[PDB]
Every structure is written in C-alpha cells, then in structure tokens.
C-alpha cells in the first residue's frame with residue numbers, strides 16, 4: 552500500500568527545484584490563470600528564511616502534494632504560532648491520505664519546536680477543503696471574515 | 704483630531720510596545736495573561752518582518768496595531784498581515800482606528816507590497832463594523848481551524 556512508499560519531507564535550502572515543483576502543483580490544483588512564477592533569486596531568498604517551512608509529499612521523486620507555513624513570533628507568549636498558508640494534493644492523488652499525512656508531519660515538527668498552535672484556513676465556499684480540514688482532528692473551528700486592501 | 708499622532712515603532716521603542724500590549728490586554732479583556740519577558744519582546748521588535756503602529760495623544764498610547772510581513776511565492780511583492788488592532792475604550796469612535804489603517808497601508812504601499820489583510824470573527828459585530836468602515840477592497844467568508852499543540 553502507498554502508505555509504505557509515501558515520504559513527507561521538509562524542504563531545506565538546497566531544495567529550490569522541489570519548491571518550484573510544489574508551486575507548479577499549486578498553479579495546477581488551484582487552477583491559477585496567467586500566473587508568472589517569481590524569479591528564482593526571490594524564491595531562494597524565501598526558502599532561506601528562518602520563518603518559512605515547506606513540506607512536500609513524495610512518491611519516488613515526484614511531488615504529489617505539499618504545504619507552506621509561516622512562523623509568527625508572538626508578543627503574548629514565548630511560544631510561536633505557525634500559519635499554514637497553502638495545502639494542495641495532485642488531483643490524481645486526492646482522497647488517499649496524503650493531506651492528512653502532511654498535516655500530521657507539520658504539527659509534529661512544530662510541536663517539537665515548542666510552538667503553541669498551528670492554524671489553517673479554508674474558504675466558506677470550498678466544500679472540498681472544509682471536509683478535508685474537518686478530518687484532521689482540529690482543536691476547534693471558527694467562522695471569520697477576511698478583509699484585504701489591494702495596494703497601488 | 705490634530706493632536707493625534709500615528710507612530711511606527713522602531714527598535715528603541717520597547718516601552719511603547721509594552722504599553723500597546725497592555726492596551727490589548729485591557730481592550731480584548733484577555734484572560735490568564737502573563738506578559739513575556741522583555742528580552743523576548745525586544746527580539747520580536749527587532750525582527751525585519753514585524754511592524755507595530757501606535758496612536759498617541761501626547762505621551763499616552765490610545766490605540767495600535769501589529770503586522771507581519773509574509774514574503775510570497777506567488778509574487779515578489781510581499782503581503783502584510785494585520786494581526787491585532789485595538790483602540791482604548793475611552794477613545795473609540797473618534798477616527799483613531801481608521802487613521803491607523805490608513806498609515807499602515809500607506810507604509811506598505813511605499814515599500815511596494817501587493818496587499819494588506821486583516822480578519823475579524825464572524826460573531827464580532829463591533830470588529831466587523833469597524834473593518835467595513837475602512838473601505839477594504841473586498842471581504843471573504845473563511846473558516847479558521849487551529850491545532851493546540853502539546
């Protein structure tokens with residue numbers, strides 16, 4: 552069974568090729584139109600940051616899913632928060648346990664680092680993403696409203 | 704008012720950062736709260752990805768907000784996440800929160816960011832009322848999930 556072959560890996564600084572592969576998976580799975588990938592100098596800078604962690608799911612050397620996360624150091628606690636910003640699984644591999652393994656590995660990593668909490672969000676209209684998140688034993692869920700300002 | 708000043712905190716502003724944290728504790732009615740040690744708070748203030756704005760009447764902090772820079776992989780232009788915003792209860796509904804948002808967006812515009820965002824709980828009418836008054840570009844209904852770690 553694939554469970555005995557799937558590997559979850561946290562990307563290191565030499566993993567720009569795998570990071571680009573995951574961004575391409577995001578482009579495909581989120582159906583991003585007219586996307587121009589940032590230059591590799593920028594993506595390398597991001598991968599080098601101490602507050603950004605990428606996890607990928609691999610079968611052989613093929614990336615079948617992954618997630619991105621940001622560290623938010625807190626002023627209320629000495630234990631940080633982690634914000635999972637994106638998670639996606641290749642459409643051919645969905646509903647096979649990969650997303651759950653990615654969440655498990657991510658939360659294990661941040662537990663070992665002494666973080667307080669990990670969080671992730673889904674759009675109210677995204678039935679697929681909500682059903683997934685509700686299957687990962689989250690501590691709680693809350694309805695929230697997101698506001699943004701597009702800058703000039 | 705013209706006496707109101709908006710200040711972006713710098714690395715020599717730990718005392719004002721602590722006053723803003725205490726304002727948060729009071730305005731959010733935070734429970735079972737013990738402030739981190741000042742070594743920790745100074746290290747956070749010194750981060751290149753964290754910016755605090757405060758509102759002052761003379762020496763008194765009457766509101767403020769905190770924000771995190773999120774460098775993107777979909778764009779070279781970054782995002783800013785406004786994490787907390789509060790105004791002292793005695794000074795609310797006098798334009799202070801709107802002035803803080805304006806100053807924050809102006810700052811991130813000058814630095815070439817793509818977008819600033821902020822969130823409110825769906826049950827929090829007061830915070831939803833305030834955010835909608837700041838003329839945001841759009842709003843979206845989302846579900847927030849958290850995992851409390853051992």
Ligand SMILES: CN[C@@H]1[C@@H](O)[C@@H](O[C@@H]2[C@@H](O)[C@H](O[C@H]3OC(CN)=CC[C@H]3N)[C@@H](N)C[C@H]2N)OC[C@]1(C)O
Nearest residue numbers: 581636637638673674697699701777817818843845
């Ligand atoms: C116009 N500027 C935009 C900016 O407002 C923001 O829009 C977000 C929107 O795409 C998100 O839904 C997409 O995102 C993902 C994961 N990446 C999965 C499903 C996708 N349909 C939504 N959850 C939050 C929205 N705020 O991010 C994109 C942007 C181009 O920067």
Ligand SMILES: CN[C@@H]1[C@@H](O)[C@@H](O[C@@H]2[C@@H](O)[C@H](O[C@H]3OC(CN)=CC[C@H]3N)[C@@H](N)C[C@H]2N)OC[C@]1(C)O
Nearest residue numbers: 667668693727731732786787788823824827849851
């Ligand atoms: C148990 N772990 C906790 C973690 O889940 C989280 O709880 C959040 C709670 O404070 C927030 O309430 C405050 O939000 C703010 C801004 N600070 C102003 C209005 C307040 N009502 C609520 N909006 C969302 C909750 N998830 O923060 C504390 C924690 C200890 O880390």
Ligand SMILES: [Ca+2]
Nearest residue numbers: 585586587588
């Ligand atoms: Ca393209």
Ligand SMILES: [Ca+2]
Nearest residue numbers: 589590593779
């Ligand atoms: Ca460039």
Ligand SMILES: [Ca+2]
Nearest residue numbers: 710712713716
């Ligand atoms: Ca100052």
Ligand SMILES: [Mg+2]
Nearest residue numbers: 583584585586
């Ligand atoms: Mg085209």
